[PDB]
């Protein structure tokens, strides 16, 4: 299934740490607070980060500072109090990385899914 796509929620929903692992793009889960639940090995392999290790950890505090910013962060907060998460822009990931741009979907799950992927 594609990055963008408009159900994307509903086929993630079914999916596994495997399936979750066999996408084309990135894929986090967050809850509202920003704590990492799912992770899947395509993000790791853009940012350079284990799945195993960052389940748990705050993504906007301690993982991806860079998006600790109103275009990113603050589009996360005002997509959760509003409940209807749904919005993709370009970034650039930059810490503890080589800089890398990037294009990213933020979506709500059918918890706060962040897709990501290479431009």
């Given at each position: 299934?594609?990055?963008?796509?408009?159900?994307?929620?509903?086929?993630?929903?079914?999916?596994?740490?495997?399936?979750?692992?066999?996408?084309?793009?990135?894929?986090?889960?967050?809850?509202?607070?920003?704590?990492?639940?799912?992770?899947?090995?395509?993000?790791?392999?853009?940012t350079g980060r284990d799945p195993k290790?960052?389940?748990?950890?705050?993504?906007?505090?301690?993982?991806?500072?860079?998006?600790?910013?109103?275009?990113?962060?603050?589009?996360?907060k005002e997509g959760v109090a509003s409940?209807?998460?749904?919005?993709?822009?370009?970034?650039?990931?930059?810490?503890?990385?080589?800089?890398?741009?990037?294009?990213?979907?933020?979506?709500?799950?059918?918890?706060?899914?962040?897709?990501?992927?290479?431009?």
């Amino acid at each position: 299934v594609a990055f963008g796509s408009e159900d994307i929620e509903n086929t993630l929903a079914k999916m596994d740490d495997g399936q979750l692992d066999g996408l084309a793009f990135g894929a986090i889960q967050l809850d509202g607070d920003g704590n990492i639940l799912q992770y899947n090995a395509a993000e790791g392999d853009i940012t350079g980060r284990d799945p195993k290790q960052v389940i748990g950890k705050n993504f906007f505090k301690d993982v991806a500072p860079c998006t600790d910013s109103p275009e990113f962060y603050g589009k996360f907060k005002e997509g959760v109090a509003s409940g209807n998460l749904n919005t993709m822009f370009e970034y650039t990931f930059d810490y503890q990385m080589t800089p890398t741009k990037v294009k990213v979907h933020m979506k709500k799950a059918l918890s706060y899914w962040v897709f990501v992927k290479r431009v």
